[PDB]
Amino acid sequence: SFMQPFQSTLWLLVGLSVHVVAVMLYLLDRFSLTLSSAMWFSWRVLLNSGIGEGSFSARILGMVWAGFAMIIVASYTANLAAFLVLDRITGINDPRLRNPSDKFIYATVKQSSVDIYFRRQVELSTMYRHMEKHNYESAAEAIQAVRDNKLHAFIWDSAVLEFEASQKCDLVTTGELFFRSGFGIGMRKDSPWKQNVSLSILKSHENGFMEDLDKTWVRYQECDSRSTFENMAGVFMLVAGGIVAGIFLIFIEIAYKRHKDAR
Amino acid sequence: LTLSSAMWFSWRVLLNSGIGEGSFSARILGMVWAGFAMIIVASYT
Amino acid sequence: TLWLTGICHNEKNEVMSIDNMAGVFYMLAAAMALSLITFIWEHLF
Amino acid sequence: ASVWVMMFVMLLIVSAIAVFVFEYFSPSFTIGKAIWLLWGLVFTTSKIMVSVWAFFAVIFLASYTANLAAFMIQRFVDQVTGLSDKKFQRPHDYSPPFRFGTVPNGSTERNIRNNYPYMHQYMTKFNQKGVEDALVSLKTGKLDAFIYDAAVLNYKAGRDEGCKLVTIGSGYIFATQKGSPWKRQIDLALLQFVGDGEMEELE
Amino acid sequence: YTANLAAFMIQRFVDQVTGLSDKKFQRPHDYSPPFRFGTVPNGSTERN
């Protein structure tokens, strides 16, 4: 996800507290081990590589510091659970559409039945200065407007939008079916073949030819649901650079201290 | 090592009182069991 | 319902979002004082 | 998947570093002790440095506690797909045999007579008289689920007590006087009501 | 107590000004910086 979100001053306080642990564990040795021991005991207990053993009151204080270390681990893992598990346009009932703004402009294609359903109702009065002043010539222009992030949402027929949402990762069909009508056939009033065609429509509903077009054209495609990380990759980079710098200082410090010991 | 040792190693690692040390493939399998123990602790918490 | 509601009507328990509770600032004031309990007892008996 | 290979690579890097660091404690076995300490710390100069990596391993433990909290909380499942199941079509080819009834002389019964009369040979062993019969046989487990006009199932599905009684899918609906001058009046009126959404007000 | 401290620090919301009972309004120059409150002139609350 990120780098460390935990207020880097607090990480500095953690480092200074580790040095306070080192100071306390070396200055209290003399009350009955003052060179390199209690450094590695601080990096043993405060890294929790070893919680166990290795006068009395100094070690009482040290296990109080181990209690601090366990509480800090508990609090940071609680924050890792919190800030990863813890905390849109829903339809016409939004104040984004009841009070349509210019940061939220929306459109259709002119000379459509969708604009007819806009122009019939009364409460869409504030909407007509967006839905009639910004419109398109094709719905693919609105698709590109989503893809170019031009306009935030669009209002179209359900099936094509659900298909295209099942195609690519730019689209989610939100809201209910607005203006629930049927999809009919353009037939003149003196056309005598409203009859047997509608009988075939009854056959299509009853014998599942509607479901046959559901199989043969509708129901094919889906998308994923977001189910080896950026935090992980940051850990790889930081730990890799730290190991390289640490190893290339190991040679220098051990060489100088071996030639100190050769004296 | 066949009388009372690996009982206390099982109660050392599976209680996680000691995760560390104490042929090769048996100990590979044992640290796989320690991985199971850590995953089970993570799931129950 | 026509005119009122904006976003404060949908207020969602604006807690903190890292933290700087007091805590250890009390506890450290105990801990060094614990040494002030103990290391004055220089057993000169 | 890919996190695993990263773990293998980083353990090989730390193991080789441990090999050279044991080579310069020479002024006790990387084959032995160092590997099992890596195992213990995932789950003496450079030992504090490796305890730092143990602290990192604890951080990776905490991150996948948060991840597994994201998995097993954010499962919802179902059992019956519909008529595509052989639950309906071959009920005695699954033990126990399946238990579905209808109200007699209905529309969906005509539809399944058009579909499968053998299914009716099963269904007539389970037919009812009322909708409260279906309520009892779901709440007492006497019948498995139901095929009807699914709108009535959508009314009384939410009206159940506790609502563990799952109907067919998430709304997956199967089966998808002459000469009166009233017809134009009624249909244009219904266009007005659907255009005004007062049916939604009744909803 | 990881679960308990997750119940504490998630389930804080706080505020600062109580109202006219504060000396924020009543003694604004007795707190640095002095306090900053205005009104629309010739109003009802100004009469109050």
List all chains that touch chain E, counting a touch as 3 or more CB pairs closer than 8 Å. A, C
Spatial distance between the Cα atoms of A127 and A105, rounded to a whole number of angstroms: 9
Query: Which residues of chain E come before a gap where C and the next N are over 2.5 Å apart?
Result: 11
Question: CB distance D65–A77 less than 8 Å?
Answer: yes
H/E element, A250: helix A230-261
> Does an interface of 3+ CB pairs under 8 Å exist between A and C?
yes
My answer on whether omega of the bond before D96 falls inside 30° of 0, hence cis, is yes
Burial class (CB in 10 A: 0-12, 13-18, 19+), D178: exposed
Does A28 contact C at CB distance below 8 Å? yes
Check CB contact under 8 Å for A61 and C12: no
Whether the CB-CB separation of A72 and C18 falls below 8 Å is answered with no
Coil, strand or helix at A82: helix
Length of chain A: 263
**Packed helices A56-85 and A37-45: angle between N→C axes, nearest 10 degrees:** 40
CA distances from C22 to B28, C19, C25, D26, E16 (A): 45, 10, 6, 48, 19
DSSP A127-176: THHHHTTS-BS-HHHHHHHHHTT-SS-----HHHHHHHHHHSTT----S-
Residue in chain E lying closest to A70 (CA): E2
One DSSP character per residue, chain D reads -HHHHHHHHHHHHHHHHHHHHHHTS----TTTHHHHHHHHHH--TTHHHHHHHHHHHHHHHHHHHHHHHHHTT---------TTSHHHHSGGGSSSPP-----SS-HHHHHHHHH-HHHHHHHTTS--SSHHHHHHHHHSSSS----S-HHHHHHHHHTSSS-----STTT--S---TT-THHHHHHHHHHHHHHHTHHHHH-
Alpha-carbon distance of D95 to D111, in angstroms, equals: 27
DSSP code, position A31: G
Q: From residue E20, how far is each of E24, E26, E27, E39, E46 by CA, in Å?
A: 8, 7, 11, 15, 14
Are 3 or more Cβ–Cβ pairs between C and D shorter than 8 Å? no
Measured between CA atoms, how close is E12 to chain A, in angstroms?
Answer: 14
Q: Give the span between the Cα atoms of A22 and A27, in whole angstroms.
A: 9
Report chain C residues touching chain E, CB-CB < 8 A: 13-16, 19
b/e sequence A70-99, b meaning 16+ C-beta within 10 Å: ebbbbbbbbbbbbbeeeeeeeebeeebbee
- Give chain E positions within 8 Å (CB) of A74: 1-2, 5
Distance set, CA A50 to CA A41, B30, C38, D33 (Å): 8, 20, 27, 16
Taking contacts as CB-CB distances below 8 angstroms, the residues of chain C near A6 are 18
Q: What is the DSSP letter of C38?
A: H
Q: Which two tokens stand for residue D169?
A: 């899918």
| Nearest by Cα to A17 from A55, A72, A58, A54 | A72
Task: Give binding residues of E for L-glutamate as ranges.
Answer: 44-45
CA distance A146 to D119: 48
Contact (Cβ atoms closer than 8 angstroms) between residue D82 and residue D168? yes
Residues belonging to chain C with any Cβ–Cβ distance to chain A shorter than 8 Å: 5-6, 12, 17-20, 24, 27, 31, 34-35, 37-39
Closest-CA residue of A relative to C17 is A83
User: In this structure, what token pair is assigned to residue D47?
Assistant: 């030992």
Of A5, A61, A87, the CB nearest to C31: A61
Binding residues of D for L-glutamate: 107-108, 149
Residue A233, SS3? Answer: helix
**Which residue out of D7, D29, D36, D60 would a mutagenesis test of the B interface target, given it has the greatest number of B Cβ atoms within 10 Å?**
D36
Token reading at A261 = 């010991």
Q: What is the spatial distance between Cα B15 and Cα A125, in angstroms, rounded to a whole number?
A: 70
Question: Nearest-CA distance from A71 to chain E in Å?
Answer: 9
HSE, side-chain direction, 13 A CA sphere, residue D10: 25
> Which other chains touch chain C, taking contact as 3+ CB pairs less than 8 Å apart?
A, E
Q: What angle do CA E2, E3, E9 make, to 5 degrees?
A: 85
A79 part of contact set with chain C, CB < 8 Å: yes
Q: Tell me the three state secondary structure of residue A108.
A: coil
A81 interaction partners in chain E (CB closer than 8 Å) = 6
Chain D residue with Cα closest to B41: D65
Angstrom distance (rounded) from CA A73 to CA D59: 9
- Chain E residues within 8 A of C16 when measuring between CB atoms: 9, 12
Helix D33-42 to helix B24-44 angle (10° resolution) is 10
Instruction: Please give the Cα distance from A133 to A118 (Å, whole number).
Output: 13
CA distances from A42 to A51, A59, A99, C40, D113 (A): 10, 12, 62, 25, 81
**What sections of A28-154 are H helices per DSSP?**
37-45, 56-85, 95-98, 113-120, 128-131, 139-147
- Which is nearest to A58 in space by CA: C31, C28, C40? C31
Distance CA B30, CA D142 (A): 51
Asked whether B33 and B10 are in contact (CB, 8 A), the reply is no
Chain E: closest CA distance from residue C14 (Å): 5
Smallest Cβ distance to D36: which of B31, B37, B42?
Answer: B31
**Number of residue pairs across B and D with CB atoms under 8 Å?**
28
E16 touches chain C (CB under 8 A): no
Which class for D184: exposed (0-12), middle (13-18), buried (19 or more C-beta within 10 A)? exposed
Contacting residues of B for D41, CB less than 8 Å apart: 19
Separation CA A183–CA D193 (nearest Å): 17
| Chains near B (3 or more Cβ pairs under 8 Å) | D
Whether omega for the bond prior to residue D97 falls within 30 degrees of 0, making it cis, is: no
- Quote the CA–CA distance of A66 and A45 in Å, as a whole number: 7
Distance of CA D195 to the CA centre of its chain: 36
In whole angstroms, give the CA distance from residue A119 to residue A101: 19
| Whether A81 and E5 lie within 8 Å, measured CB to CB | no
What is the Cα–Cα distance from C23 to A72, expressed in whole angstroms? Answer: 11
Q: What six digits make up the tokens of A256?
A: 């100088």
Which residues face A109 on adjacent strands? A136
CB-hemisphere CA count at 13 Å for B15?
A: 8
CA distance E32 to A117: 60
Tokens 């070690």 belong to residue:
A59
Model resolution, angstroms: 5.5
User: How far off is chain E from C36, nearest CA to CA, in Å?
Assistant: 31
What token pair was written down for D80? 């019956």
Alpha-carbon distance A170 to E26, whole Å?
Answer: 55
| CA–CA dist B13, B37 (Å, integer) | 8
Amino acid at E35: F
